[PDB]
Amino acid sequence: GEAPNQALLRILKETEFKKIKVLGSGAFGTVYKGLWIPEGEKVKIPVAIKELNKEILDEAYVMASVDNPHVCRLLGICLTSTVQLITQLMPFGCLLDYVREHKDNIGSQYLLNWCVQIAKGMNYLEDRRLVHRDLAARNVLVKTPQHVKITDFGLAKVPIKWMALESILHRIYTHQSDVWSYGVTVWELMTFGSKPYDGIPASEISSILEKGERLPQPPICTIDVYMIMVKCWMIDADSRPKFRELIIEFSKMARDPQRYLVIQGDERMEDMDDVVDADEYLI
Ligand SMILES: CCC(=O)N1CCC[C@H](n2c(=O)c(-c3cccc(F)c3Cl)c(C)c3cnc(Nc4ccc(N5CCN(C)CC5)c(C)c4)nc32)C1
């Protein structure tokens, strides 16, 4: 029923990349800020290098199969004694931290454009018949403040406060259950990083949603924006919007940003000669 997955998985020599600095230490892995120089190609590509296995290779398998401006991509892997994944560096970190750090300087144009790009990347995953199951502001990376990407397909094929009701109850996951988390994600951005249902036990979340309660309208949010969030959180999943509609809706609003989001002050907010961004390095 499926078409053959003709993705290419690139194996890289460890002498082809050098690790400059550390970005994260996690029980699963440690990740390095680094640089990748394909052999005799006279390019240096800024990369994130992950060191730790059926998990890490499943992750690599998925990332090698996606090609989209708003989805993270795998550049290659190294079958070193400790297996290494080589991915594109996202200099500004994850969007959740970004939004918390710079709230006093984030305008409505930026917020709405991010909603467009995540909708684009998620619509792409739907095209690829792929289901993310962990979309959240913590899993959107920032390449430039103008360009974000969806990341962390650890669960692609547990975060209850981002989860659709069907998912909490029956462990069902859909593109439409992804739309729910898109709404929760949008809510994280419009509240500038607040935690959803803060100070609530996860065990209660299922009953609360069944009662008809949801997350509050963020102060900067016109009802136009909040209506879109609310529709992403309907019980009936064929009632929620399609990602392709979310693209259209947020794109309309991104034309007149100030009409949809009201933000105080919103109006006015050694050798690197051969470095190329991975987005322009093609094979
Ligand atoms: C959720 C964010 C998160 O905390 N961490 C843990 C460490 C990096 C991790 N991280 C990946 O896991 C992955 C990834 C995803 C899937 C598979 C795979 F092999 C990989 Cl490598 C990628 C692509 C990645 C790309 N760019 C980047 N830039 C980046 C990260 C952190 C920072 N900091 C450090 C300084 N300040 C203390 C705060 C902010 C900065 C400035 C840039 N970080 C990436 C994810």
mmCIF file of N, CA and C in Angstrom, residues 139-223:
data_model
loop_
_atom_site.group_PDB
_atom_site.id
_atom_site.type_symbol
_atom_site.label_atom_id
_atom_site.label_comp_id
_atom_site.label_asym_id
_atom_site.label_seq_id
_atom_site.Cartn_x
_atom_site.Cartn_y
_atom_site.Cartn_z
ATOM 1 N N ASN A 139 9.771 21.152 21.321
ATOM 2 C CA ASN A 139 10.255 20.382 20.183
ATOM 3 C C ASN A 139 10.135 21.155 18.876
ATOM 4 N N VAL A 140 10.259 22.478 18.936
ATOM 5 C CA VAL A 140 10.456 23.292 17.745
ATOM 6 C C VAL A 140 11.785 23.989 17.926
ATOM 7 N N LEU A 141 12.684 23.821 16.960
ATOM 8 C CA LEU A 141 13.983 24.461 17.047
ATOM 9 C C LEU A 141 13.994 25.712 16.184
ATOM 10 N N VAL A 142 14.915 26.628 16.508
ATOM 11 C CA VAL A 142 14.978 27.963 15.917
ATOM 12 C C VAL A 142 16.278 28.078 15.137
ATOM 13 N N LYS A 143 16.170 28.150 13.806
ATOM 14 C CA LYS A 143 17.335 28.357 12.944
ATOM 15 C C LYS A 143 17.730 29.825 12.906
ATOM 16 N N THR A 144 16.791 30.685 12.534
ATOM 17 C CA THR A 144 16.823 32.128 12.720
ATOM 18 C C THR A 144 15.513 32.502 13.382
ATOM 19 N N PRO A 145 15.407 33.709 13.973
ATOM 20 C CA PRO A 145 14.121 34.108 14.560
ATOM 21 C C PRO A 145 13.010 34.113 13.525
ATOM 22 N N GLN A 146 13.372 34.063 12.248
ATOM 23 C CA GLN A 146 12.417 34.057 11.156
ATOM 24 C C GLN A 146 12.092 32.660 10.642
ATOM 25 N N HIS A 147 12.712 31.611 11.180
ATOM 26 C CA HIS A 147 12.647 30.291 10.551
ATOM 27 C C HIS A 147 12.795 29.209 11.613
ATOM 28 N N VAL A 148 11.716 28.473 11.902
ATOM 29 C CA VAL A 148 11.747 27.410 12.911
ATOM 30 C C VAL A 148 11.524 26.044 12.248
ATOM 31 N N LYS A 149 11.851 24.978 12.983
ATOM 32 C CA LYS A 149 11.739 23.614 12.465
ATOM 33 C C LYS A 149 11.184 22.687 13.545
ATOM 34 N N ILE A 150 10.405 21.681 13.132
ATOM 35 C CA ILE A 150 9.887 20.683 14.069
ATOM 36 C C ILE A 150 10.917 19.586 14.257
ATOM 37 N N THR A 151 11.095 19.164 15.495
ATOM 38 C CA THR A 151 12.152 18.245 15.860
ATOM 39 C C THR A 151 11.664 17.117 16.745
ATOM 40 N N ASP A 152 12.592 16.272 17.160
ATOM 41 C CA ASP A 152 12.294 15.196 18.090
ATOM 42 C C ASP A 152 11.249 14.178 17.690
ATOM 43 N N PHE A 153 11.491 13.456 16.606
ATOM 44 C CA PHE A 153 10.616 12.358 16.249
ATOM 45 C C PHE A 153 11.009 11.095 17.008
ATOM 46 N N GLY A 154 11.170 11.222 18.314
ATOM 47 C CA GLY A 154 11.442 10.084 19.158
ATOM 48 C C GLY A 154 10.296 9.098 19.160
ATOM 49 N N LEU A 155 9.076 9.613 19.160
ATOM 50 C CA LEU A 155 7.890 8.784 19.242
ATOM 51 C C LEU A 155 7.177 8.616 17.925
ATOM 52 N N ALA A 156 7.781 9.055 16.837
ATOM 53 C CA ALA A 156 7.088 9.065 15.562
ATOM 54 C C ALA A 156 6.782 7.671 15.054
ATOM 55 N N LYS A 157 5.656 7.513 14.362
ATOM 56 C CA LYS A 157 5.228 6.212 13.812
ATOM 57 C C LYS A 157 4.261 6.327 12.618
ATOM 58 N N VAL A 158 5.084 10.188 29.264
ATOM 59 C CA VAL A 158 4.266 10.620 28.132
ATOM 60 C C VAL A 158 3.567 11.962 28.456
ATOM 61 N N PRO A 159 3.430 12.857 27.438
ATOM 62 C CA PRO A 159 3.071 14.292 27.676
ATOM 63 C C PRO A 159 1.571 14.599 27.738
ATOM 64 N N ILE A 160 0.954 14.309 28.886
ATOM 65 C CA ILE A 160 -0.509 14.249 28.960
ATOM 66 C C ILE A 160 -1.136 15.615 28.677
ATOM 67 N N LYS A 161 -0.478 16.686 29.122
ATOM 68 C CA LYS A 161 -1.034 18.023 28.976
ATOM 69 C C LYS A 161 -0.959 18.542 27.542
ATOM 70 N N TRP A 162 -0.255 17.834 26.673
ATOM 71 C CA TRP A 162 -0.225 18.167 25.259
ATOM 72 C C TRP A 162 -1.060 17.221 24.430
ATOM 73 N N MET A 163 -1.706 16.273 25.087
ATOM 74 C CA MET A 163 -2.292 15.123 24.418
ATOM 75 C C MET A 163 -3.787 15.217 24.179
ATOM 76 N N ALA A 164 -4.219 14.723 23.030
ATOM 77 C CA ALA A 164 -5.619 14.717 22.672
ATOM 78 C C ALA A 164 -6.348 13.784 23.594
ATOM 79 N N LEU A 165 -7.637 14.002 23.770
ATOM 80 C CA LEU A 165 -8.401 13.186 24.689
ATOM 81 C C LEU A 165 -8.413 11.734 24.261
ATOM 82 N N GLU A 166 -8.541 11.481 22.971
ATOM 83 C CA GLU A 166 -8.579 10.111 22.500
ATOM 84 C C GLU A 166 -7.274 9.443 22.859
ATOM 85 N N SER A 167 -6.198 10.200 22.789
ATOM 86 C CA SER A 167 -4.873 9.652 23.048
ATOM 87 C C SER A 167 -4.699 9.295 24.520
ATOM 88 N N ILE A 168 -5.155 10.160 25.428
ATOM 89 C CA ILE A 168 -5.072 9.870 26.860
ATOM 90 C C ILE A 168 -5.884 8.626 27.211
ATOM 91 N N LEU A 169 -7.037 8.444 26.565
ATOM 92 C CA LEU A 169 -7.950 7.396 26.997
ATOM 93 C C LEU A 169 -7.622 6.057 26.353
ATOM 94 N N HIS A 170 -7.505 6.036 25.025
ATOM 95 C CA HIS A 170 -7.414 4.801 24.255
ATOM 96 C C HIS A 170 -6.070 4.625 23.562
ATOM 97 N N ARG A 171 -5.077 5.461 23.865
ATOM 98 C CA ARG A 171 -3.766 5.391 23.216
ATOM 99 C C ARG A 171 -3.870 5.455 21.684
ATOM 100 N N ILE A 172 -4.908 6.142 21.166
ATOM 101 C CA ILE A 172 -5.061 6.403 19.735
ATOM 102 C C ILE A 172 -4.312 7.685 19.383
ATOM 103 N N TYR A 173 -3.631 7.685 18.237
ATOM 104 C CA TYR A 173 -2.917 8.861 17.767
ATOM 105 C C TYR A 173 -3.196 9.052 16.284
ATOM 106 N N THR A 174 -3.512 10.292 15.889
ATOM 107 C CA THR A 174 -3.895 10.630 14.519
ATOM 108 C C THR A 174 -3.144 11.892 14.115
ATOM 109 N N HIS A 175 -3.158 12.194 12.812
ATOM 110 C CA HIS A 175 -2.811 13.539 12.378
ATOM 111 C C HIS A 175 -3.658 14.561 13.118
ATOM 112 N N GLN A 176 -4.942 14.227 13.347
ATOM 113 C CA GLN A 176 -5.842 15.106 14.088
ATOM 114 C C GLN A 176 -5.501 15.167 15.568
ATOM 115 N N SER A 177 -5.005 14.086 16.163
ATOM 116 C CA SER A 177 -4.493 14.244 17.519
ATOM 117 C C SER A 177 -3.242 15.117 17.523
ATOM 118 N N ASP A 178 -2.498 15.134 16.420
ATOM 119 C CA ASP A 178 -1.399 16.087 16.303
ATOM 120 C C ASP A 178 -1.916 17.528 16.284
ATOM 121 N N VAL A 179 -3.058 17.755 15.628
ATOM 122 C CA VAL A 179 -3.634 19.093 15.572
ATOM 123 C C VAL A 179 -3.922 19.619 16.980
ATOM 124 N N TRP A 180 -4.435 18.766 17.865
ATOM 125 C CA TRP A 180 -4.621 19.167 19.258
ATOM 126 C C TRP A 180 -3.339 19.744 19.838
ATOM 127 N N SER A 181 -2.248 18.980 19.784
ATOM 128 C CA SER A 181 -0.989 19.469 20.339
ATOM 129 C C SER A 181 -0.512 20.734 19.645
ATOM 130 N N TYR A 182 -0.767 20.870 18.338
ATOM 131 C CA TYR A 182 -0.516 22.138 17.652
ATOM 132 C C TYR A 182 -1.220 23.294 18.358
ATOM 133 N N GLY A 183 -2.491 23.094 18.719
ATOM 134 C CA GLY A 183 -3.211 24.095 19.485
ATOM 135 C C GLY A 183 -2.585 24.376 20.840
ATOM 136 N N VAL A 184 -2.228 23.320 21.575
ATOM 137 C CA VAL A 184 -1.520 23.528 22.836
ATOM 138 C C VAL A 184 -0.193 24.247 22.587
ATOM 139 N N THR A 185 0.496 23.922 21.479
ATOM 140 C CA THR A 185 1.769 24.587 21.186
ATOM 141 C C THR A 185 1.534 26.067 20.954
ATOM 142 N N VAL A 186 0.578 26.394 20.070
ATOM 143 C CA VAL A 186 0.205 27.783 19.794
ATOM 144 C C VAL A 186 -0.080 28.514 21.092
ATOM 145 N N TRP A 187 -0.809 27.853 21.988
ATOM 146 C CA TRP A 187 -1.064 28.403 23.310
ATOM 147 C C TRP A 187 0.227 28.677 24.081
ATOM 148 N N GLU A 188 1.236 27.815 23.952
ATOM 149 C CA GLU A 188 2.497 28.095 24.639
ATOM 150 C C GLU A 188 3.153 29.360 24.100
ATOM 151 N N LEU A 189 3.081 29.574 22.787
ATOM 152 C CA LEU A 189 3.721 30.740 22.196
ATOM 153 C C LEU A 189 2.981 32.024 22.574
ATOM 154 N N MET A 190 1.643 32.017 22.463
ATOM 155 C CA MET A 190 0.836 33.197 22.759
ATOM 156 C C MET A 190 0.866 33.590 24.226
ATOM 157 N N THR A 191 1.151 32.657 25.128
ATOM 158 C CA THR A 191 1.344 32.957 26.544
ATOM 159 C C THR A 191 2.804 33.185 26.886
ATOM 160 N N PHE A 192 3.674 33.191 25.877
ATOM 161 C CA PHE A 192 5.096 33.483 26.013
ATOM 162 C C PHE A 192 5.831 32.440 26.853
ATOM 163 N N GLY A 193 5.367 31.200 26.813
ATOM 164 C CA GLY A 193 6.068 30.101 27.436
ATOM 165 C C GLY A 193 5.423 29.521 28.675
ATOM 166 N N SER A 194 4.200 29.907 29.002
ATOM 167 C CA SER A 194 3.611 29.441 30.245
ATOM 168 C C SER A 194 3.368 27.942 30.155
ATOM 169 N N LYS A 195 3.324 27.284 31.319
ATOM 170 C CA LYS A 195 3.117 25.838 31.287
ATOM 171 C C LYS A 195 1.617 25.524 31.295
ATOM 172 N N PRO A 196 1.154 24.631 30.428
ATOM 173 C CA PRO A 196 -0.283 24.344 30.371
ATOM 174 C C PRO A 196 -0.774 23.588 31.592
ATOM 175 N N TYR A 197 -1.909 24.031 32.110
ATOM 176 C CA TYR A 197 -2.516 23.423 33.274
ATOM 177 C C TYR A 197 -1.535 23.392 34.412
ATOM 178 N N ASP A 198 -0.827 24.486 34.621
ATOM 179 C CA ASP A 198 0.203 24.485 35.631
ATOM 180 C C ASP A 198 -0.435 24.205 36.958
ATOM 181 N N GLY A 199 0.275 23.464 37.791
ATOM 182 C CA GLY A 199 -0.255 23.045 39.066
ATOM 183 C C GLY A 199 -1.501 22.197 38.962
ATOM 184 N N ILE A 200 -1.548 21.326 37.970
ATOM 185 C CA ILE A 200 -2.603 20.336 37.907
ATOM 186 C C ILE A 200 -2.042 18.939 37.715
ATOM 187 N N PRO A 201 -2.570 17.983 38.461
ATOM 188 C CA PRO A 201 -2.147 16.592 38.324
ATOM 189 C C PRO A 201 -2.559 16.043 36.981
ATOM 190 N N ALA A 202 -1.679 15.298 36.342
ATOM 191 C CA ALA A 202 -1.978 14.770 35.033
ATOM 192 C C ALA A 202 -3.179 13.855 35.128
ATOM 193 N N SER A 203 -3.282 13.131 36.228
ATOM 194 C CA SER A 203 -4.374 12.176 36.381
ATOM 195 C C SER A 203 -5.730 12.848 36.193
ATOM 196 N N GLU A 204 -5.833 14.133 36.549
ATOM 197 C CA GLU A 204 -7.087 14.876 36.453
ATOM 198 C C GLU A 204 -7.399 15.361 35.035
ATOM 199 N N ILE A 205 -6.373 15.519 34.185
ATOM 200 C CA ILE A 205 -6.546 16.149 32.878
ATOM 201 C C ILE A 205 -7.632 15.443 32.067
ATOM 202 N N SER A 206 -7.667 14.110 32.099
ATOM 203 C CA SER A 206 -8.651 13.394 31.294
ATOM 204 C C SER A 206 -10.083 13.776 31.686
ATOM 205 N N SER A 207 -10.372 13.821 32.994
ATOM 206 C CA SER A 207 -11.722 14.164 33.442
ATOM 207 C C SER A 207 -12.061 15.606 33.094
ATOM 208 N N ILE A 208 -11.083 16.500 33.245
ATOM 209 C CA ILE A 208 -11.306 17.920 33.025
ATOM 210 C C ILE A 208 -11.710 18.179 31.583
ATOM 211 N N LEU A 209 -10.960 17.631 30.626
ATOM 212 C CA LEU A 209 -11.334 17.768 29.219
ATOM 213 C C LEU A 209 -12.696 17.150 28.921
ATOM 214 N N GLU A 210 -13.058 16.075 29.624
ATOM 215 C CA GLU A 210 -14.358 15.460 29.391
ATOM 216 C C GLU A 210 -15.473 16.361 29.869
ATOM 217 N N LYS A 211 -15.191 17.156 30.900
ATOM 218 C CA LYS A 211 -16.142 18.117 31.434
ATOM 219 C C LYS A 211 -16.331 19.336 30.526
ATOM 220 N N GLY A 212 -15.459 19.534 29.533
ATOM 221 C CA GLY A 212 -15.583 20.634 28.601
ATOM 222 C C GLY A 212 -14.663 21.799 28.880
ATOM 223 N N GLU A 213 -13.807 21.699 29.902
ATOM 224 C CA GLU A 213 -12.814 22.718 30.212
ATOM 225 C C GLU A 213 -11.627 22.631 29.243
ATOM 226 N N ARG A 214 -10.971 23.776 29.023
ATOM 227 C CA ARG A 214 -9.790 23.876 28.172
ATOM 228 C C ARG A 214 -8.888 24.969 28.747
ATOM 229 N N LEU A 215 -7.800 25.279 28.051
ATOM 230 C CA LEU A 215 -6.861 26.328 28.442
ATOM 231 C C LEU A 215 -7.439 27.721 28.190
ATOM 232 N N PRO A 216 -7.072 28.705 29.012
ATOM 233 C CA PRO A 216 -7.660 30.046 28.875
ATOM 234 C C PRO A 216 -7.144 30.822 27.662
ATOM 235 N N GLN A 217 -7.965 31.768 27.223
ATOM 236 C CA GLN A 217 -7.583 32.751 26.218
ATOM 237 C C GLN A 217 -6.375 33.554 26.690
ATOM 238 N N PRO A 218 -5.233 33.486 25.999
ATOM 239 C CA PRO A 218 -4.086 34.282 26.420
ATOM 240 C C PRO A 218 -4.380 35.758 26.259
ATOM 241 N N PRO A 219 -3.897 36.601 27.183
ATOM 242 C CA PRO A 219 -4.207 38.044 27.138
ATOM 243 C C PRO A 219 -3.988 38.732 25.799
ATOM 244 N N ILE A 220 -2.920 38.409 25.060
ATOM 245 C CA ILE A 220 -2.675 39.085 23.785
ATOM 246 C C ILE A 220 -3.593 38.597 22.675
ATOM 247 N N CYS A 221 -4.403 37.575 22.926
ATOM 248 C CA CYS A 221 -5.096 36.872 21.854
ATOM 249 C C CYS A 221 -6.466 37.471 21.611
ATOM 250 N N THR A 222 -6.672 38.034 20.419
ATOM 251 C CA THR A 222 -8.037 38.262 19.971
ATOM 252 C C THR A 222 -8.810 36.943 19.952
ATOM 253 N N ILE A 223 -10.138 37.063 19.980
ATOM 254 C CA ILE A 223 -11.003 35.900 19.875
ATOM 255 C C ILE A 223 -10.784 35.160 18.558
#
